[PDB]
Every structure is written in C-alpha cells, then in structure tokens.
Amino acid sequence: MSYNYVVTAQKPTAVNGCVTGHFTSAEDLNLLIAKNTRLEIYVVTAEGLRPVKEVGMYGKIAVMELFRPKGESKDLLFILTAKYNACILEYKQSGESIDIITRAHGNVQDRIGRPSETGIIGIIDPECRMIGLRLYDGLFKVIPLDRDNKELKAFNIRLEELHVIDVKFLYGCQAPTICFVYQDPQGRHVKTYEVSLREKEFNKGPWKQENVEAEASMVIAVPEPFGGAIIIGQESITYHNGDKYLAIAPPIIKQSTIVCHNRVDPNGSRYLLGDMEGRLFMLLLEKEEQMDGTVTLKDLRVELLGETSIAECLTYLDNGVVFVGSRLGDSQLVKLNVDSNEQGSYVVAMETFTNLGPIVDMCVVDLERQGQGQLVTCSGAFKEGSLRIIRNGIGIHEHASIDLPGIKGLWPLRSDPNRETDDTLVLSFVGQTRVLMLNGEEVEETELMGFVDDQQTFFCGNVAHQQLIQITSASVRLVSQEPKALVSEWKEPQAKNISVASCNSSQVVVAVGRALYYLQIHPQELRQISHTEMEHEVACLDITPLGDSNGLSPLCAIGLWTDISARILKLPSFELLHKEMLGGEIIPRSILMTTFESSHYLLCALGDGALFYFGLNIETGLLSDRKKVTLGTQPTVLRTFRSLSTTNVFACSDRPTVIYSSNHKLVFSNVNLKEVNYMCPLNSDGYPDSLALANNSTLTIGTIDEIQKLHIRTVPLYESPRKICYQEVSQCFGVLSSRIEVQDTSGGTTALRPSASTQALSSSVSSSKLFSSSTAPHETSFGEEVEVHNLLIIDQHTFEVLHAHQFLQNEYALSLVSCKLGKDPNTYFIVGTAMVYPEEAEPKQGRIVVFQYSDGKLQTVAEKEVKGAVYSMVEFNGKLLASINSTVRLYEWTTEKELRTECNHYNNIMALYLKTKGDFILVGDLMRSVLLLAYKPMEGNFEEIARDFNPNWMSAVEILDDDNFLGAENAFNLFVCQKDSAATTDEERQHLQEVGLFHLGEFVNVFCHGSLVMQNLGETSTPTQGSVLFGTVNGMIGLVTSLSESWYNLLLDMQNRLNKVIKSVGKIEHSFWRSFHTERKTEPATGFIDGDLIESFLDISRPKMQEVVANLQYDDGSGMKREATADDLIKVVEELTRIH
C-alpha cells in the first residue's frame, strides 16, 4: 500500500459568499468574504476594505449570514459548510491580537437522505429564535438559538414542497415566518409558513401562496419598515407581504439571470442584484405609509449601474461603494458614480482582489536557474482572462534598473530638511562612493555635498538634529541637511582604515581593526565618549533602532573575522552581555537588530549563505530561541526595511528571502528575484514602502507586494486563456488564448475588445492551407460570434506579451507543450490544433504545429497532420507524446524538425491529458479515469499494465513516482493509483488499486510535476518522494508527495490526535471534513496525510495555541511522544512551508 501527503500551498481565492453588517464592532460596518474553506474579515472604510483577520475553516462554506440575538452588542456570524458543519462565530480582539471565537458548533449530517438538488441554503430568523437550513430534499432543518445550545443540533421538519430554490425569513411577523420559492411541474410558486419549534411542524403563514414568474429564483428578505420579501426572476420582480402584491418587469434585467443579492441600506430601501453576465443592478423600494401605522412597499424600480466581473455575491460598503465578490474571476471593489463614463457605466473599480480560479492549465519552469521552479497558471475567461505567477516567497515589483555593478551597501538619505520622505540614495563602492538623486519614479546619478566620494562608505543615514551621517574607510563625516555641507568630522585615533560602520538617530559605532568607538551625535558636532578593543577584528556591526524608540538602541550587535560568531555589546561602554557562536565556513558578513510587531529579534548572516536568527532581549542583551535556515551558497547580507505600515528584514543572497511575522510568529519565505547582494529601505515620494536591491551587476528599484506565504502576480489578457507551457531556450512561456470577434457585413470580423492577441509588440497569422478545404455553414453570416485562437509568447522575467500568433479560421488549439525534442537541446513550442465546426460532434482532422521563438519573433518550424483532434501533449524522454481523439501516439523528432509516429495505444475512449515520469505514461481519459501505460524502448512500443476501474471524468493527470499515480475526482476527493505488483490474476493485474481515499474539498482542474519551493531535482535527501502541484476551480494550489510507511504511520497518529485538540474557526471536527465524501456515502479518510491540519495551527491566535497543545502528544519525527508546546506545532509549520 502506498501513502501520500497532501498540503495546500496557496489558499483558495475564489469568493463563495459575502455579507455586510456589524461584525467587529457595534458602530462600524464590516464586510465578510467566504472563499471556500477560508473566511476573511474586512473593515469597511471610506478608502476601501481593510483586512483584520483570516482563518481557515475545516469545511467548504455554503451559507454565511449575520444576525444579532437579544443582548448582543454586535452581529454574530453563522456558517454552514457543505460538510454539514454548523457554527456560530463572534469577533474578538484584545490589544493587537485578533481572532474569531466560536460561540456554538455541531454537525447536522444525517445518515440517510438525498442532498438537496438546489444546493445548501440557510437562513436566520430576524428575532434569532432559530436557524433554518435546507440540506436534504423535502426536509427543513431548524436549529434553536438558545444561549445554552452549545451543540448546534438540528431537527427535520417535513415540508410538502420538496424542491425549493431559495428561502428567506419574513420581517414584521410576530411568529417565525418563512417565505420561499419552489418549482412545480406547472411553474414556480411562492409560499409562506410559520415555524413551530415545539411541535416540529409548519403552519400556514400570514398570506397564501401566489403564482410567480416561472424563472423566479432569488428571494430578498426585506427588513422593516418595509417588511415582507422580494422575489426576483428572469424578466420581472414581484413583492409579497400580506395582502400586498406588486410586480415590475424591467427590460434591462431580461438578458441576464440574477444569482445573488445584498442589502444596501439598513432599512431595506435598496438592494444589490448581481448576475453571471457581470451586470450590476440597483433595486430601489418605494415606501408607502399605511393607515394602521405600518409601512409597506409601494412600487419597485431597477436601474443598471454598469459592468463588473462575474458576480457570485455582492456586498454593499458605504458611500455608494459596492463590493463585487467573484468566484470565476477577480473580485472587485467598485464605486457608484453620479455621472457615467464614455461607455455609459456608473461603476468604476477602486481595488481588485486576486483570484487564481478557475485554473485551466499551468506549468513549472526554473526560469531563474535556481532549482526552485516558477509556476504560471492560466486563470479566468474572456475579458477576465489573465496569467497568474505563483511562487513560494514574497514578490517585489521592479520599476527601474541602473547599471551599478560592485555595490557594497545602500542607505537612504533625506537631503531636504523640509521633507519626511527619502530624496537621496547612497551607493557604496570599493575605493569610491556615488550618490543617486530620487525624483519621483526616476533615479539619476548626482553628488551630495559634504560626503566623501573617494572612499568606500560602510554606513550612512539620517540622524537627529536635521543632519546626515556618512562613515567611510577614512573618516566619520557629519553633514547637515542644509546647506548640505560638512559640519563636523571625527577621525580614528589609531590612523587605521574603518572596515565596518553603523548609525542611528543619536548613536554612532565605528569598527576599525579590533577597536570599537562610540560617538554621540550633537547639532553640528561629533563627540567621542568611549571605545573598546575586541579580541578579533569586527566583520559587521549594527545599532539599528528597535520597537517605537526615536531611532535609539542601547545595544550593538557585532560579528568577528576569526571565531565566526555574533556578540551583543552594551553602549557606550561596549560591555559584553551575550556571545553566540554562529559556526559555518565563512565569517559573518552582516548582523542586524530588527523588530516584528513590536517584538525584538536579532539576525546574523554568514558569507557561506547560512542565516541564523534568534529572539532578542534588549533589557538583558541575551539571545534565545535560536534557529538556523540555509538560504544559498553565496554571501548573505541583512538589512531592515519599513513598508506596508510594518517592519521587516530583507536577506540579500543568491536565494533572497524576506523575514516577516504572521500570527505573531516569524515566517521565512524566498523572493522572486534572480539574486541580490545588498539592500536598503526606500520611502521617497515616488517610491513609498519600497526596496533598493543591488545585485552583482545592476541596481534594482521596486515596491514590495502584499506579504503572504505564496505571492501571486497577475498579467491580464482580456481574452480567454487555454493552455500554458515554458520554453527554456527562449526564456518565454507559451500561452493559448482566444478572443471573440463579430462578423461584419463586409465578410471580415471586428474584435469586441482589445486583448493580448491584438496588443502584442509583434504578431503573425498562419498561412497553412490544410483546413482551407472546408468552411462553416455560417462562414459568411452576419452578427455571429467567431472565436479566434492565438499563441501568446510572454517573457519569463517580465511576463510581458512579446508576440502573438493567430491560427487559421475555425482552427482550435486544444493543447500546448514546450520541451526539448529528440537530441536537439533547443526547446520548441508544440501546439495541438483541430478543425472544429458546430455541426461536427468530433473533429476528424487536426495537426501539430511546432513554433520556435527567437530574436523577438515567433517562427513556425513545422506542421504535421494527424487523424483527429489533438487533446494533449507531454515531454516523454525527449519525445513528443500526443493524444489524438481516442488514440495516444508517440512521435519521434526527425532531423527535419518534423514529428513522425513511432508507436501508439488504442485502448482508450478519448485521452485528454498526458504527463510522464521516467519510462511511465499516465493517461487521463474522458470517462474511464486514468490508465497505466509503460514504454519499452527495447521494443519500441507501449504495453498496458493496468487501468483504474473507478469511473471519473478526469480534468488532469500526473505521476508521483514509478508506482504512485495521482488523480482527482469530480466529488472533491483525491485518489492515487498504484501498480498492483502483488496481483496474481489477470483481473487484479489489470486493475489499478486505490491506496486511500481523501476528501480535499476542492475540484482539481490541473496537475503538474514540480514544486513552488526548492526542488530535490532527483536527490533523495528530501523526506518525501515525488512532487506534483495541482490547481483547482477555486484557485487553490496544493502539493502531493509520496510517503514511506514510517512517515505515514507517524503522521497518521499525529493527524488523529490533532483532529480532537485543534480549535479552528467554528470548532469543526477535522476528521469529518477530510472524510471521503460523495452524494451516496461518507467514509473515513485513509492512506493520505492532511498537511493543512498542521498548518491550520498557524491561523489560531496564541490564546488558542495553549489550549490545543495542552494534553496533546506530538511526534517531532523522532518517534517519541511528548506533550506538545505552542512552539512545537509552529516550528513544524515553518518546516512544512519549505516543502511546498
């Protein structure tokens, strides 16, 4: 039996629901976004949405609603997951620590019952007497909201109407009253009933059922004074409340189906209506005061606001700002204007939230030649299409680059005394110094008066009294900001060259040979107070300020040239408080004191690429909690920077990394840059919150992006992407995409919108006549939409669109692979295309076209006609393996650069995906799951060994190892096939065995061999075997690896113990979430280790960590069981983030 490890590298990004209300405080408006298993809390402000906390839930969110029981100061948040896990959450904050506390929880799953065909729907009574849930057809679950109902048990009340599309509680009723829209064979009707919790029965509501539009689906609960409910269909909207009936049919909504809604005003006067077409509508309620003192609806009005991304849920903020939650594309925060734009829209986007989903394809390439690999995924469709670059690490956006080789250090200066932002940058060089002027986005060489240009600068920066300090090999120079002139100079009493320096607002420390001098900074004067002598010469020293001090630090950290160690000295006397041995082969190059979230830490880097970090106690000058991480083989330099309103550290090396704090714990993540030697913070007017990164040959100027474990960069296409591959030789990615053009009366076509295929720097059109023999029956029709495919070439470093090649009319590109062919070291773009017409169920003719990108142009190399559509292509040991309809064919690469078939396999229905490892081929079928083929180079043909007999509509395939083959099910479960070497019969030998059942909660759309973090590249030092990344419809990216028997048993006991102790948001039992889940049956998970369970420990705040670890036995990998501490689960998580 094989065992596998499954971990999520990038959390789901698609939005599945969103609500507005008073969640974090009684006065502020809050916006809550549910992204499958992730709940994100945002505060509504005039400027936008401010995230406060994010928690991972053990389940897929289907219902999320706010409610306020009597006696509560703020609304409570209820979630019902697709795994029947119910929970009530409340926002709690203490000082700087933010977390979500579960008020109640429990599972409501039944052993028998048909899950509802309309999906999971849940509602909360306005008076908070009960929560109504629709999980099964014909059954309505009620959860009483008693204050002592710790377990959210639900009871089933029989409803006569089995199939209900939407349900809401009515406002203004004395008894709990539910209104719902249900579909009968005679059309859709709306009925209401009262809920009796003691009788477990439904009674006739305040008004009788009324016939409504056959497309009626969405129900809006209408708060008082209005009360009642609004029913939304395809063409009309109808309002029901007691004796009142009102209906309107706006033509502006007839072209799109409304899928979601949200309250705009607290009194229910306005609501948002969203749709699948991205048309945002405003629903307005006209009020009429009644003679009995009540208020009822007078009329309905709907206005078109404009176009947005596809809306899955809407949430109103304030001041006319609308949040558009998107499941199939990026979510948008947009503002409603009074005046329309040139397109007639009133909606202008202010901010965009990245969504990787739907992920259609992806590939991993080592474009930086570092051995890690960069994953680029195709996401979205039509105007929302884009490329997403995902890497383990923190990304930075490059805006400028200057040819400044040989930089030995960087420091910002404020030469203008009237500005708080940076306006000057100092470059240190051996034997000389240079200064760059900062003018907005532009950077130019200049000279700053008072500074030494003929000596190497070791440290400089801003100091108190409106002065700048520069320390060079020859002397210490104090230069005022105005008139930018030297005011005071200090010289070494030993007449020796300074080798190290550091400065802060009032303290200066200089290292010359073994001597350390402490100087005070005074207005227009430097003063020497004291000095000491070290046993060995100092290689690095730092007095960077910590915490909230005014640029002051009582301690100085140093490193030495001889004993390879770090020391803490107390100023001014330089008293030694702590000595820590670093070890390694090369002396320390930089030592740094920094602060993370007001917590003090010390870091020191060696010239051999090793990084040592420890907790720093300033009051005592002692180090603790020592940990070591290896970054690379080149010297590493440590410097602190301030960005994004927080303080962090950048480690410059051949594998640069950013040190940052998340959930009050340090996380070490790489950077998506080729290499950096030295750096400094930038806070200029044009570069606020930016970094200056100096590499071996050039200086890179740029800005830090959102700090997350996995960074995502977006390259919009404005057209539908299809497939992606990497061409190593040309340093480019190939992408298949398509745009929609409308055919005119002239016979030509016009694009509806510009896209990457039309905005490329250069382009070409295929001249082949292979498909000219046949045309569409509507080839000359007018007004018909025509889909045009193109191959886009994007640079691996800038990801800009370099070239676009257009394919022939009616030619669809189904697959794309780029690899080395035959014995030719050059990698080529291989595109599988087919001739497709609407009347042809299955293409009978297609071709494989090989392109080479060189010298800025994409040139077609060769084309090979094939008997059928090409669905997939993979690199197989330098050969081109392609799937053509029902047959898999292996093509050899000839000296003429043309493909020739060598062997094939016919025992398939339709091979949609191909991935290979070693000599094994894994083929994904349209309906027959995956099959195991093996290639025999000595025979020159394929032999079928076994195939999976568990039917599944595959979306992609990949091989974990020679024996372990990975697939995904349409039921949100993962599976791994193993060759049954123990089989004795033909039935057993031909059947791939399942080695476990694991419920992921996500639908995997693509598989790809590789990793987002440093790969083993065939080495066996990695504790896991194999590395396959996978993408999902919701933008989730995970890693699957194989486990040995020992790892599986060790981690399985860990998982079973963690399932009962870890208190995640909602306090949902983890063992149920991961249990194998289908519409027919649920089974306990086996054969897989859930890495998300351990990593979820990083989301819970410290107050919960103590309760989770208490009475928990944790295995650190030695096999010994000991009681866990908070740092044990955090430490393992830090290691886990380095394997995926």
């Binding site: 028998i112 019952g113 979205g380 539908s720 169920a841 299955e842 293409p843 039917p951």
Partner: protein
C-alpha cells in the same frame, strides 16, 4: 447562429465552468457509448451457493444490489470484490424468488421481493436498513417492480394485477426520523393503496401475467409487458390509470422491458427479437430487431444513451445502435459473455439434465453505473430446472 455540439467546446468550457452548458452531455456519453463496449474487461465474482440472480441495481459507486431465486437479497462490492448479504424481511402475517429490483427516483428507497414472493419488501439506502414490513396485497408471486415516484411504487404479479403502494408524508417523515435518530432501525407497517388489473384485450386473457415494468420519468408513464403478446401503458403521475395498449410482433418470452428516455421508445424482449414501441404510433407499428440468439430467449434489456444492451439465454449481451440502426461490430456482432460462475449439480439436475455437465450462465440482469462505463452483469443457467449463479463487473 448554429448549434455547437462539438466536444471541443465542452472541454474548453469545462475548464472554466463559466456557465458550461449541459447540452454537451448527450454527445459526451453517446461518443463513449459507442467505443466503451469493445474495451471492457471481465471481472467475475464468486457468489457462493445462491440459486440465481434475476435483478440488480447500482446502489453506490462500489456496490450493486442483486436479487435471487431463493429470496436472498445481497450487494456485490465491485470495488473490493466482496459479497455482503441483506436480511430477508418477513410479512405482517405468516401466509419464485426476486425477479425484479428497482430504485426510487430519489435513490433513497430500495424495493425488492420479500421472504414471501408475493410480498414487497422495502430497504433503506445507502444503509440497507429495513424500511417496511412485507405486504400481502398480491394473491400470487410478484414478478415485476417499478418506482413511479419518490413515495409510490407499483408491483406486478402472475395474475396480471398491479399493486399501488404509496408512502405518505407522515410515514416517510417518521421513518426517516427513526433511522437518523436511533442507531437501530425500525420498520413501518404498510398495505397497498389500490389494486388494479391490466386491461383485457383480444389477446390471451389468461396469460395476463406482468413480467416487467418500466417508468418514464419525463412523461410519468408506467409501461408494462405481459406474456400475452401485448404491451400496456398506464399513467402513474398521481394515480394508476390505463392509457394505451399496443401489439407486440412476438408473443413468446416477453420477459424484459426497458425505456429509452432520449428516444421515447419502449424496448420489449421476446424469444429472439427486441421490439421498439412508440405510444404515439398505431398499435401495429412496432419495429423488431433480431438478437440472432434464436431459441434461447431475451432475458434482459436496457438503454445506455442510444445503445440498447440485450441479454440472452446463451449468457451473452448484444449492443444495438439506434442511430446507426444496426448492432455494433467488434473491433461479427460485438457481444460480452458471462463466466462459469457456480452450477449446482443437485437432484433436480440429476433427474432432468444429467446428460449435460455445464450450462451457459444466462444474462438475467445487467445495469450501467452513473458514469456509464461500468456494466454489471449477473444471472445463472438458462434452464428453469437448474440452480446456479453468475456475476461480474465489466469495465
């Protein structure tokens, strides 16, 4: 704007699920339905000493329920190749075998024959827990079962009667509540709502036995095959009432009925030919296709998209292509064959069939899974005087 039926558009839309249309499912399944039958491999199971298997239905992705001549109900776990038996339920009073099994449209209630062949037994899915006591509505053995709704089921008999059983909202609510609350299941007592006979036509009124039933979910019709050579169509949308009758081209061995939902055609087996019936056509306008297995009889029939699967007494399964109007050819009609299974050389065999040591295992039941790629086949020896069983999963 032309209609797009190509699977290429399906593949590119499925990757994004951006309002992907369901109209492509017909082509997806039909394309595979033509190529799948020739690529299937045989997986035979050992059923032990069970008499025969006459009926089977898919209950899960891993298990198929099977009924037997000895009234034993069991499920074959095709994923693990294991046999699990289900307890046989008794009637309300202590007053053959299981010839038919059917699942309700909701896949929550399993209807099989009980300990007494004249009684219907109800089992809960997926747990297999008992639901109701065996009824006594019929005066003779039940040969056919069909679920007309989520709560209603109709069962036929040798005397030509069809019992109408209905579960009310209160009965179903209490039954479900008991099974989910109490770990130990509790069955309810039931009786038939009404009993109606098939119409008496100018054909043999005595051979009025209803051997097969099939329900059309789209038009809410209950079709019935009698052995008098006539097909009967009843309405079963809310109450049981006769609609129409048509004449079959053959009046011998009309033991199996299936309905093609994509073609609106009723398939009726016979001694050699499969009849294609259309309620909208004259009673004489019935087409027949010969299975080529003359003299052995057609024992089962089912629709997989536009491909009709026909089981015969020789233990083989034939595939008929409606669109091509011909039988599928092997990559020479393409056909699957059953294995040896288990044959009981008992006293009855010794008395009547002692001159033959082995008989082919006739295909009495077969069913496709939800994906359409797994075909479960089960049966036993063709002769009524012999005991023996076969089952296997083709994939």
């Amino acid at each position: 704007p032309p209609v797009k039926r190509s699977l290429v558009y399906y593949l590119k839309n499925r990757e994004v699920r951006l309002q992907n249309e369901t109209s492509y499912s017909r082509v997806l399944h039909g394309y595979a339905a033509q190529q799948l039958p020739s690529l299937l491999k045989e997986r035979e199971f050992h059923l032990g000493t069970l008499n025969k298997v006459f009926a089977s239905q898919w209950l899960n992705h891993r298990q198929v329920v099977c009924g037997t001549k000895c009234n034993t109900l069991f499920v074959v776990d095709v994923q693990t190749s294991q046999i699990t038996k289900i307890p046989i339920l008794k009637d309300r009073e202590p007053g053959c075998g299981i010839h038919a099994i059917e699942l309700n449209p909701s896949r929550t209630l399993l209807a099989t024959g009980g300990d007494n062949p004249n009684s219907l037994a109800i089992y809960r899915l997926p747990t297999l827990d008992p639901v109701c006591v065996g009824d006594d509505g019929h005066k003779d053995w039940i040969f056919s079962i069909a679920w007309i709704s989520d709560t209603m089921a109709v069962s036929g008999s040798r005397d030509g009667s069809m019992g109408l059983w209905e579960v009310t909202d209160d009965v179903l609510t209490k039954s479900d509540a008991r099974h989910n609350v109490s770990r130990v299941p509790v069955y309810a007592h039931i009786t038939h709502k009404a009993l109606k006979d098939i119409p008496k036509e100018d054909t043999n009124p005595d051979n009025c036995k209803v051997r097969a039933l099939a329900f059309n979910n789209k038009n809410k019709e209950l079709g019935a095959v009698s052995l008098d050579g006539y097909f009967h169509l009843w309405k079963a949308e809310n109450t049981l009432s006769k609609l129409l009758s048509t004449k079959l081209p053959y009046c011998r061995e009309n033991v199996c009925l299936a309905y093609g939902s994509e073609w609106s055609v009723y398939a009726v087996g016979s001694q050699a030919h499969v009849s294609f019936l259309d309620p909208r056509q004259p009673s004489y306008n019935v087409k027949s296709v010969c299975s080529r297995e003359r003299g052995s009889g057609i024992r089962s029939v089912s629709f997989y998209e536009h491909i009709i699967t026909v089981g015969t007494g020789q233990g083989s399964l034939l595939f008929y292509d409606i669109r091509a109007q011909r039988f599928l050819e092997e990559r020479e009609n393409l056909k699957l064959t059953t294995g040896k299974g288990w044959l009981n050389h008992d006293e009855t065999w010794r008395n009547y069939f002692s001159d033959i040591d082995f008989f082919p295992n006739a295909v009495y039941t077969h069913c496709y899974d939800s994906s359409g790629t797994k075909l479960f086949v089960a049966g036993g020896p063709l002769p009524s005087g012999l005991h023996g069983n076969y089952a296997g999963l083709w994939s």
